A paper describes a structure:
Cry11Aa and Cry11Ba are the two most potent toxins produced by mosquitocidal Bacillus thuringiensis subsp. israelensis and jegathesan, respectively. Cyt1Aa, Cry11Aa, and co-crystallized Cry4Aa and Cry4Ba. Solubilized protoxins are activated by insect gut proteases enabling binding to gut cell membranes, subsequent oligomerization, and ultimately gut cell lysis leading to larval death.
As the crystals are naturally labile at pH 11, we aimed at collecting data from crystals soaked at slightly lower pH than 11, hypothesizing that early conformational changes would show but the crystal packing still hold. A 1 % unit-cell contraction, and hence tighter crystal packing, was observed in the “pH10.4” crystals in comparison to the “pH6.5” crystals.
Numbering used by the authors:
A (entry chain B): 17 to 329, 340 to 352, 361 to 655
B (entry chain A): 12 to 329, 341 to 351, 361 to 657
The structure:
Amino acid sequence: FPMYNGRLEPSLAPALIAVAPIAKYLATALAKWAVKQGFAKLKSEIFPGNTPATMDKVRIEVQTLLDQRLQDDRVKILEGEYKGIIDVSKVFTDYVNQSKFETGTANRLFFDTSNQLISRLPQFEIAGYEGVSISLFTQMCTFHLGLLKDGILAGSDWGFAPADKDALICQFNRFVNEYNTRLMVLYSKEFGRLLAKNLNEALNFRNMCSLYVFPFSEAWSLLRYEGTKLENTLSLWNFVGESINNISPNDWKGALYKLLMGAPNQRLNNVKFNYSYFSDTQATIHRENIHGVLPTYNGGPTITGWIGNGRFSEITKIKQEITYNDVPAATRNEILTATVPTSADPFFKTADINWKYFSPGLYSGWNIKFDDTVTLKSRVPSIIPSNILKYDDYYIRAVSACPKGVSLAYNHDFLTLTYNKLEYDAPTTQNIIVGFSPDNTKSFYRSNSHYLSTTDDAYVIPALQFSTVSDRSFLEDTPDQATDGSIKFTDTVLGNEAKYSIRLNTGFNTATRYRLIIRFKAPARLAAGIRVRSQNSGNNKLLGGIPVEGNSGWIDYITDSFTFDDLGITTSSTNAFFSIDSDGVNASQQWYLSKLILVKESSFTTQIPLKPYVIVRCPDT
Amino acid sequence: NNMINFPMYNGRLEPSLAPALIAVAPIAKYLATALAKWAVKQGFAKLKSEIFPGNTPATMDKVRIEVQTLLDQRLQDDRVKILEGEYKGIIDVSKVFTDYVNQSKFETGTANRLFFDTSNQLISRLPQFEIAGYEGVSISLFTQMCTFHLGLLKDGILAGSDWGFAPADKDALICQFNRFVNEYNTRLMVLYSKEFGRLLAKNLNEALNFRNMCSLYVFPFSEAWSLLRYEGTKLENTLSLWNFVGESINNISPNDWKGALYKLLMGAPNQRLNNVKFNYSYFSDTQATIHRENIHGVLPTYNGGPTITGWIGNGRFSITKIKQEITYNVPAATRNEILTATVPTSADPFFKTADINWKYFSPGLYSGWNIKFDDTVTLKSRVPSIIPSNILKYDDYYIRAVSACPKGVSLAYNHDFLTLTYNKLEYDAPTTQNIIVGFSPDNTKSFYRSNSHYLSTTDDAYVIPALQFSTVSDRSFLEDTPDQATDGSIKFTDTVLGNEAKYSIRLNTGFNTATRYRLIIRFKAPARLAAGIRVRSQNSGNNKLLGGIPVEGNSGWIDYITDSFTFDDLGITTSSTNAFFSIDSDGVNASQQWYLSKLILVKESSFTTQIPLKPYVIVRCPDTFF
């Protein structure tokens, strides 16, 4: 049975899922919002033609991808909630889209739609079914936040006094964080449940959220502004091997996900497998096993080690043939190696890794193949089915594994980005995990630098796509950021910094005025704060000194306007950098770095404020 | 297996002379005073009274017998009387010039002639101290003679018209000082490399003994030659002393020493010792006649990074400890234990003295080890006989590092990967069978205890050695540059990313933050750097550039003096705990690999460049041609 990622039917391409047009429109609306029309166009994508057809298509896709189904009664309930949302949203849309309308009536019909979603939203936080309902709950919160943004920008045009306008801004800032928290509650409940049930199943749920959920939670954090870029750099993970369960979310956060990422800023160079073959004297037993996986990436500052072991329970390969007189008659322990080819595209695209245990138990072998190069064909006398691991518009960035037979709760404080060797010893792994990264990241991982074009209104620099980083820095899984993670700075005495190499493509307008948006989470007050700099061949320019007073949520800091002529960066500048540094932090002052966003000053604008305009404070009870 | 039962002192029967009581110590203590404030027209008179006190060769005779005793090398009797006559010639001519200038009034044209009678007397008699085949003993003598001549030229330069030197005659002396300060240094390293290279192939313990002598008798003065053209600096020596205990190791190349062994001995050059682990194995036979102890590896762990240290030798048992007792009908007792020597946690967290000894007995049945630091016994030999004491100790010195040399393997592998950071500093070997102890002078206790350079407003100059850093970039190596009177330099080789190194600095309570200072950077950049070398200061986000050094390429060490500044301009106060001094550059290829020796913080009021690099009047220096 030719399998596709363990399934008998090939999965739908990521660029063709039902939420793709919604995500493509949000990318356009985040670059330039249509005043008093953004909600009408968003409604046309979430409910096309005033039908729940997209929400039905989203449901059946996620139900097929997760193998989880909603009850028949709950489906007809959601159908009624959809009709209620569609009916009330169309009435408000048709009335404001006239040549002349009474602003007092549009205000009434607005609150009929605004409060229709607030009261019907918990119907999508389905208990015991949040694995499927998280993708539906994601669109309803996008539908309501889009309504609140158009209501703020309309104001008097829709019957909102300056005090009514600030009440909507207060709801926006509350719901942009409440919907995010309620989204992570549905995610953690299901991802935590599946980590203890089946690791391959837990990865499959995270892959679904990386395409149906997390791109839109990032759009929420960008819905405040105009002129940024919606970018998703999350990775997809396929699991091949024996089942692994009873994984806790703490083990994933502080160990397993760190081993899977490997060197988060480097491409794969070669991966090594601890392979052992066993055959009995009657030629009836054939058992192949993978005891360890050693991924070597294209550079530092991360040092990788064995996941599992490289031990033969330095020798490259050892064969053995034994003859007895009435136990192994043939024994082969070999360190296999799959090498990434040196070319203009130094990445693996597809993989054919499969593991099959036969019913009597005598046969159990592995197949390893990347692109068209066969690393291991099973020595089992029978053929092992093909298991194509691939995603369209995705490439293989990392190949790792999960330690088997050991607890994943050890050495969490020492699985850092630098200094310490990124490894986790185990008797065996018997599994191979492949990380697929989207093609939009292929430019950085090929050249180890961020090339900038003057025709782009915004560029997103993920935190994990760095050049160097300080010691005592960790990797934090922040999938709600539409990225593969964040950096957790924990150095106590010396400073905490991280540099990002930048290059200017030929023909770049070095005179255009840019701004830098820094997304970070600093929970405690920092006396010296956080500094943003740029280093080009000795010309160290300070772009901003972020005042840190303490906040539990993510904070976007927008530096003052600047140009690359002020920074001394040209086309031939091969030593340009962006630096984010701070002083030593204690346990409470440990802060996180999400991403850097370079926007044009002409196109960037903060349409929704963090604080109301007229009223002193948001309404309190 | 020697039949002499004596309490040994570093392998010798008699305790060695204290480092501060050696014969060249008064010469070194005067040079440190002259570099802080040079006595015009008297610097050579006072230097002559220390090298030749009372117009006698008594000091040079004491220096000779001390180095000959320490090195166990003896100059030929004929060659001693030769140097005796050469001393008399130098004493006679220098006394005539000194007595004539030290009178009430003297004719300046006469003091000009008697100056070159003494100058050309040293230039002609100097090759008599470059004795071929005896460079081990002669290097201590050749060092003082160059100190005698370089101090003579400096006094003549600053005198000028007082000793009959026209502005053209003054430039002629400046061109000689600039030539001899590099020619004498090159000729000095020729004598050192010939002998330290010979003994590395002969006996490692003997080669370390020679380097210990040069660290006290030679290299303190080569550094004084580099500081001789200034006034207001500090003459500091931070070289370490290395004692060897164990079986003989020979056939070591200078390349094996430069790119491997010396890195293993230093361990973490910016940290103090925390604990040392030894791979110990005991063996006894069923006849209760054989008792063999072995040290198969040494694992030194220091107080921090960024250097990651590993095993020198191995930690394998060929588990912390395993005891075996076997009965047969010929190993009957086998103990494989990883011993540990932990530096105490106190206000002075350093070992002072050690008692490490290894004795192989004549029949071959007994061979054990004794390991003891301070009053804590790490290992008492289980050999039935007592092993003599071997006190490793230098007054005014403390134990900074404890390492070993890999035995049974070549030291020419993995040189490109024995770096300061990233890669684990280790060298696998079947056995070491030796323990090497590193003694650092007490002047470095302040840094290695606090991991920071505390500055006092009462000091006219402070020396920051390159190896006493807080952080350093990747692909940075350790270069053994003993002519800098330090434990080495930093070789920056990172090709793509930048090359930087930070130095943590603190201000003692009562420091005057308004006083003006300057920074002196010594570096050897053989190729031109487009972006050059940048000197900065980082204090809690306040990055101040102190200077951008233009680098165009030079084969020698270059001293760059930044513009004057104050700690008020840098925002550094007494309570500033995150202050740093940065030395960054861009990526360098193979040819552009540069070195960093040290940083010298001097007060602007006390610092002056008294001898220039270029002459004043003449456009170019006169050459040696006809």
